[PDB]
Design a protein around this ligand. Sequence first.
Ligand SMILES: [Mg+2]
Ligand SMILES: [Mg+2]
Ligand SMILES: [Mg+2]
Ligand SMILES: [Mg+2]
Ligand SMILES: [Mg+2]
Ligand SMILES: [Mg+2]
Ligand SMILES: [Mg+2]
Ligand SMILES: [Mg+2]
Ligand SMILES: [Mg+2]
Ligand SMILES: [Mg+2]
Ligand SMILES: [Mg+2]
Ligand SMILES: [Mg+2]
Ligand SMILES: [Mg+2]
Ligand SMILES: [Mg+2]
Ligand SMILES: [Mg+2]
Ligand SMILES: [Mg+2]
Ligand SMILES: [Mg+2]
Ligand SMILES: [Mg+2]
Ligand SMILES: [Mg+2]
Ligand SMILES: [Mg+2]
Ligand SMILES: [Mg+2]
Ligand SMILES: [Mg+2]
Ligand SMILES: [Mg+2]
Ligand SMILES: [Mg+2]
Ligand SMILES: [Mg+2]
Ligand SMILES: [Mg+2]
Ligand SMILES: [Mg+2]
Ligand SMILES: [Mg+2]
Ligand SMILES: [Mg+2]
Ligand SMILES: [Mg+2]
Ligand SMILES: [Mg+2]
Ligand SMILES: [Mg+2]
Ligand SMILES: [Mg+2]
Ligand SMILES: [Mg+2]
Ligand SMILES: [Mg+2]
Ligand SMILES: [Mg+2]
Ligand SMILES: [Mg+2]
Ligand SMILES: [Mg+2]
Ligand SMILES: [Mg+2]
Ligand SMILES: [Mg+2]
Ligand SMILES: [Mg+2]
Ligand SMILES: [Mg+2]
Ligand SMILES: [Mg+2]
Ligand SMILES: [Mg+2]
Ligand SMILES: [Mg+2]
Ligand SMILES: [Mg+2]
Ligand SMILES: [Mg+2]
Ligand SMILES: [Mg+2]
Ligand SMILES: [Mg+2]
Ligand SMILES: [Mg+2]
Ligand SMILES: [Mg+2]
Ligand SMILES: [Mg+2]
Ligand SMILES: [Zn+2]
Lengths: 224, 82, 127, 211, 99, 114, 100, 147
Amino acid sequence: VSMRDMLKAGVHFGHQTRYWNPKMKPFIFGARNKVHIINLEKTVPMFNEALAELNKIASRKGKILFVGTKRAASEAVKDAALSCDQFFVNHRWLGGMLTNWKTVRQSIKRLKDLETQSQDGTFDKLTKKEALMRTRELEKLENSLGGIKDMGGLPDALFVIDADHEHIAIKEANNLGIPVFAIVDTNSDPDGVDFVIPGNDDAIRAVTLYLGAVAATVREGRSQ
Amino acid sequence: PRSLKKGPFIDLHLLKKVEKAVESGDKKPLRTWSRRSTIFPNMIGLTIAVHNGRQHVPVFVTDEMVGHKLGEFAPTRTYRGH
Amino acid sequence: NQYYGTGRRKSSAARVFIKPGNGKIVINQRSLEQYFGRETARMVVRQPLELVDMVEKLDLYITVKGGGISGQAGAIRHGITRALMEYDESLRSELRKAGFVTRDARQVERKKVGLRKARRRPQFSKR
Amino acid sequence: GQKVHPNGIRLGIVKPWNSTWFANTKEFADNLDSDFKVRQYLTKELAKASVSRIVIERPAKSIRVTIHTARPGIVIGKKGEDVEKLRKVVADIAGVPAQINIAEVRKPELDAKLVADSITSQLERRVMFRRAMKRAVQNAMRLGAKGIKVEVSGRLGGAEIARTEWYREGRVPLHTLRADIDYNTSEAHTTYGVIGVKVWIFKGEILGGMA
Amino acid sequence: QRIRIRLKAFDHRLIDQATAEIVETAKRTGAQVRGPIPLPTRKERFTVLISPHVNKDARDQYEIRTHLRLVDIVEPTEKTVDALMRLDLAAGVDVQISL
Amino acid sequence: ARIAGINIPDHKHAVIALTSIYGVGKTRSKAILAAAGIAEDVKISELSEGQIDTLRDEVAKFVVEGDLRREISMSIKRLMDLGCYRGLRHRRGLPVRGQRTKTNARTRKGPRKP
Amino acid sequence: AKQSMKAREVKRVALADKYFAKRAELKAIISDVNASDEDRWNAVLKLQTLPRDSSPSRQRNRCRQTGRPHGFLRKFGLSRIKVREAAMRGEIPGLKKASW
Amino acid sequence: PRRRVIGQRKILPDPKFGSELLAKFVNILMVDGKKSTAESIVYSALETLAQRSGKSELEAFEVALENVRPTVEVKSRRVGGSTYQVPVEVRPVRRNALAMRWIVEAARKRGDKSMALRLANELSDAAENKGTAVKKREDVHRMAEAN
RNA sequence: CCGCACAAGCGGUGGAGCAUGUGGUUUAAUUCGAUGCAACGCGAAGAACCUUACCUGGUCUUGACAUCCACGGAAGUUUUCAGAGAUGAGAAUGUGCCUUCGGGAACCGUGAGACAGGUGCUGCAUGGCUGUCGUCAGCUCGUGUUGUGAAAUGUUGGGUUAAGUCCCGCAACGAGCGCAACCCUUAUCCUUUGUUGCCAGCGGUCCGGCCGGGAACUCAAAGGAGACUGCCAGUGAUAAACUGGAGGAAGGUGGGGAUGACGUCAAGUCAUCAUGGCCCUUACGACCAGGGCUACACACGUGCUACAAUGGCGCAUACAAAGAGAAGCGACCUCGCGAGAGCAAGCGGACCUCAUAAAGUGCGUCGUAGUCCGGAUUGGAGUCUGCAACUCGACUCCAUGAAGUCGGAAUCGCUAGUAAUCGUGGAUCAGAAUGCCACGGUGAAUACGUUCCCGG
Ligand SMILES: [Mg+2]
Ligand SMILES: [Mg+2]
Ligand SMILES: [Mg+2]
Ligand SMILES: [Mg+2]
Ligand SMILES: [Mg+2]
Ligand SMILES: [Mg+2]
Ligand SMILES: [Mg+2]
Ligand SMILES: [Mg+2]
Ligand SMILES: [Mg+2]
Ligand SMILES: [Mg+2]
Ligand SMILES: [Mg+2]
Ligand SMILES: [Mg+2]
Ligand SMILES: [Mg+2]
Ligand SMILES: [Mg+2]
Ligand SMILES: [Mg+2]
Ligand SMILES: [Mg+2]
Ligand SMILES: [Mg+2]
Ligand SMILES: [Mg+2]
Ligand SMILES: [Mg+2]
Ligand SMILES: [Mg+2]
Ligand SMILES: [Mg+2]
Ligand SMILES: [Mg+2]
Ligand SMILES: [Mg+2]
Ligand SMILES: [Mg+2]
Ligand SMILES: [Mg+2]
Ligand SMILES: [Mg+2]
Ligand SMILES: [Mg+2]
Ligand SMILES: [Mg+2]
Ligand SMILES: [Mg+2]
Ligand SMILES: [Mg+2]
Ligand SMILES: [Mg+2]
Ligand SMILES: [Mg+2]
Ligand SMILES: [Mg+2]
Ligand SMILES: [Mg+2]
Ligand SMILES: [Mg+2]
Ligand SMILES: [Mg+2]
Ligand SMILES: [Mg+2]
Ligand SMILES: [Mg+2]
Ligand SMILES: [Mg+2]
Ligand SMILES: [Mg+2]
Ligand SMILES: [Mg+2]
Ligand SMILES: [Mg+2]
Ligand SMILES: [Mg+2]
Ligand SMILES: [Mg+2]
Ligand SMILES: [Mg+2]
Ligand SMILES: [Mg+2]
Ligand SMILES: [Mg+2]
Ligand SMILES: [Mg+2]
Ligand SMILES: [Mg+2]
Ligand SMILES: [Mg+2]
Ligand SMILES: [Mg+2]
Ligand SMILES: [Mg+2]
Ligand SMILES: [Zn+2]
């Protein structure tokens, strides 16, 4: 992504000067209208160097977890993961998703059992109310683990939108040593992101730019 | 009352003992546990020791007693008030 | 032609046959007011037939089993309702909002152990 | 609170009866009385054959018992001499031509009568009740059950007061009627009294009624 | 002339299988069988005090439901009557043949 | 009227009126009436002397009033003199037909005494 | 109950079993109108000499299992306690928890 | 009704007149489910009401009602630490019910050698403001102001 | 924040008579247990004998019940005397079966010891079973995270629900036992089968589905369908849910069952049974007759019938359901005023019998009274069961006709086919229901609300 490509999307935009985090000073161009302005001169090379690492991970058969829980950007992140055959979390990040993966494995097994059971049969043996209740449980499980049913094991890389909002995920990752790739607004604490991208995390246009560029480079890394 | 088609009921050993007594003149009070026997008209002028549960109390049968059961004359419950 | 309906109340059942032509009602080979001694029963059996206003337009041959006089009357009413519904669909829309296709499911509740009746509980003594 | 007998409540739903004859009020009482005498006799003779169950049917004239045990060799012995003596004594104890039958239980660690009998026989040896029931649960679970629960009660280890205690593992839904829960009790006559053991074994839910 | 056969049992699955088998044996032998007619079941109730002592309110209620079926054959031949005579059914079913 | 029972039956229906004689209940009342050929619903008013005399003639056929009271008192007195069980329960004013005395024998015992 | 009780019941049953015809014909004589009232008299005298326990009404239905005198169910011949144990185990055919 | 107060069975109207208020009246007078006995007395009383006290029996019904139906009563509630006799005004159904209750109780307090005559005379006196039901409306209006 | 907890209502209890249980006292003994809710129509689903365990007296000692050992007998059956019976003493008859002929079985009696026997003690030695909080909504665990750690979180919060029900939030995610559902029953429809059940259209009738017949309908009982907040509108973070509406037989877990988590009360039961310890072991065991459990100055609990014209009585007449039956249920007919009796059909029962429902309704009468209310009590005379109704049965008839005129303080039950009333059946049972368990008929009133009362 080129600085012009970002700037038109508005990547330079940031939170209010009232709400910023201390470690973000190096990445901040300045202030306008009491608004923090992010410096694309740092943003572009760091994003490119992160894309290099993501391409490397995906080119060694890496499993990638796209992470974002914004109600606006959930579908964008989900589609972003689907466009590169990867795994995602687009709703509330469940504390213990990585640290307590084994309990999630039982949940993934229950989701697999429910979907397989409906195709196999036995719904007729169940009463209509019971069969409908089982369908509701399957729908709830899908809304909870649609993205990670096929992750199989712990992912090899994480992509995070608004790292401050998803702070539990990054704490888990660091506890596991799983690398964190994150779009970091001025209000976030950048310590947990090993490849940090400072940029807007709310705006739909810039978020979609991040996701599309990452997914293009991930498909490229897969293709070899 | 039992019934009239069946006639009154008397225990056989009382029949035997009573006819023994009436045929052989006066006796001492003959002892009996048969509270369920009916007093019979031949059984008059005799004295019968009916067991009240713990002791044979003597009842001296008379003519207007005929028809009643022996147990009606030997109370089985001691009571004097409180 | 012939139009029947099966009505039921708490424990009664009533077969109702509708024949256009008059306003006579025969119940178990007897006339209405000579079968039912209570007036509210006569009223409740004429209820639907008078609602749809066609009284002297169709005579009724009806039999009924089980239950008491009020249950039999209610079952007869339900049967007449279902029979009329077969004769004309338009009548059913008014019959329903009159509360006649209700088929009330209310029935005597069983006696339960430890109670004197379905719900009456023995007279407890605190002191 | 007190629980309902987890076998009687499932009778007709998922659990079959252990006596399937038909009778009238005339011969109903003495029929099941001879039935009881048959059962007690068989349980006394087969005390070492690990008999899990004893079903009795009564066809038109004869009676036919089926013995579910894990030691079919012990009840069979050699060319069925022992089972033939059993046929004689059963036929004369019921006044009717008998017909004995055997059906081996294959997983003696998954039926509640045999695990309870094993626990009691161990409690005779004055083994630690704790490790006894723990081994029972571990075996039954490892063999493929969906859940199990054991409960011993009464002066455990010769103690002076009764300490009822239990240990469960897996999933034992006692309120679900579909659940095929094999339940059975047993008593252990120790020197300090009687120790009662109850065992529940849940082996999956049954879908589609009795059949 | 007719042969009327009554079947009593304690569970309806077994008795229904028995009726089916009866009528099929009668169909093999070219008879005319009135299909099994269901007759009213007899529920015997029993209420029993569960508590050994003191509690009379705590009880338990049991029920034996005798299921009863009636089959009737109107054009019997020797190969009809013998066929059901060479017929052995489940132990739980009581059969009663009448002419 | 001055029936054999020297009491005076009231001016009600003949049967209910005759029931006032001691020893004449409803059954025996209508027996008296039917045997005298007198109607059932008529009152003692509008009843001729020729009919009252038949009523007296037919009520004299029974044992009523003092004669009945004397017979009942004699039977109880005789029964008491025998020393039989019911004689004792009559002397002690306690129920003789085998009812509870542990509680509610109040008709025989009268009101309560602490 | 005590073994002597079960023994008394066995003796009563066995005794009432052997004198049944005698009791029946004596009762028939006694109740028979048109008896000569000498026959009826010696009939009642002869009847009251038979063993008291030869009366069917002297017997008392006890649990075949435990011999308990109360809580009997003629249908099963067991007390109220043993029927429950037998039913929950599945020994009484067709019997099950009723609920309506 | 701690969670939600539930309404009443909307009773079915009188078969003789199609009115539902006379239906509630016959339900009030009914004893031991003897509805036939009740409606007999009610019809007998309204018929003679239509004669001894002018025409319009169904109208004379409310002529007695509006004469007895109260407006204010007391509802002793302890919103201040003790049961305080605070007065309250009623909805229409409350005063309807209290009116019919007060009618039937006074009728039962008359004798009059019949319940038909009892109810008839009592309802007439109520319609023209005589008797005891009207007096117990007077007292319920009197003690409603006493505190 | 919940619950008939109160409130709002309706009917009661507390007063009267009787039924029954307990306490008390008495007694020869009034068997033993249950004791605040959660003992007190409870164990006992049924004490005249029996039961029965208690008492008085009469009796037995390897025993009434079981195994073993020798010895002798077939086993039985019938009959007499003494006795209250247990028991003794006999007299007659039979002396059988299988046999490898030796005996053996079958039982019976006598003898001797192991032993039997105990409803004797301890439920504070126990199992088993049950009550209770409470069908109240809770109780936890794994893994994760935080803390050196004991631990905490989850399970708190905001909503909502009958519910730890569900949603949203939240370092928690999950699960398990509970909750809900699966089960039974009830409400609608469909399919299949149609006698002993059914009778619409048919013909025939003695007018009776009774008879040809019919399989439609009611029913019977096996399969299925149906209800899910699915549809609509409105509230609500849009969510959960809530309020209404449509359709529908049924609407918001449709009604009612069964189902009772972790635990609490050293709760109840050693007298169902089983059982550790101990105690008796010619006695704390066993048999028999009679008595008691039914006593009565009293006290309490639970019921029944009442006090009346919304009723009593007489006559007439209509509509149920659910059950039981072979030492059983027992029709028709005759006899009796009646309880019942004689004769005897049918029925192991959709067939026959119990068995004609009652309140109701029509007509007549009674006129507010201790009554034509009420039926207690008592006298007389009967019937039935049963060896036997004295103690101490039920019922019938005639006579008698108490108290009682709606019950102080206080207190109980109930939210709909409920309460209240009205009959019917069953278990136990020879006989003995006002109790218990079921069944239908008629059929309400009220809920402003959560301040208080009780409990959670
Ligand atoms: Mg039957
Ligand atoms: Mg009389
Ligand atoms: Mg008595
Ligand atoms: Mg014993
Ligand atoms: Mg008896
Ligand atoms: Mg209450
Ligand atoms: Mg109140
Ligand atoms: Mg009282
Ligand atoms: Mg006592
Ligand atoms: Mg009770
Ligand atoms: Mg009792
Ligand atoms: Mg002695
Ligand atoms: Mg002698
Ligand atoms: Mg000896
Ligand atoms: Mg011993
Ligand atoms: Mg305890
Ligand atoms: Mg609940
Ligand atoms: Mg909350
Ligand atoms: Mg839950
Ligand atoms: Mg939470
Ligand atoms: Mg159908
Ligand atoms: Mg035909
Ligand atoms: Mg058909
Ligand atoms: Mg069905
Ligand atoms: Mg609608
Ligand atoms: Mg609606
Ligand atoms: Mg539902
Ligand atoms: Mg439900
Ligand atoms: Mg449940
Ligand atoms: Mg329970
Ligand atoms: Mg204790
Ligand atoms: Mg207790
Ligand atoms: Mg002794
Ligand atoms: Mg004795
Ligand atoms: Mg007693
Ligand atoms: Mg009277
Ligand atoms: Mg009549
Ligand atoms: Mg019976
Ligand atoms: Mg006659
Ligand atoms: Mg007769
Ligand atoms: Mg009867
Ligand atoms: Mg009457
Ligand atoms: Mg009448
Ligand atoms: Mg009087
Ligand atoms: Mg007075
Ligand atoms: Mg008065
Ligand atoms: Mg409620
Ligand atoms: Mg009743
Ligand atoms: Mg009986
Ligand atoms: Mg009754
Ligand atoms: Mg009822
Ligand atoms: Mg409180
Ligand atoms: Zn941001």
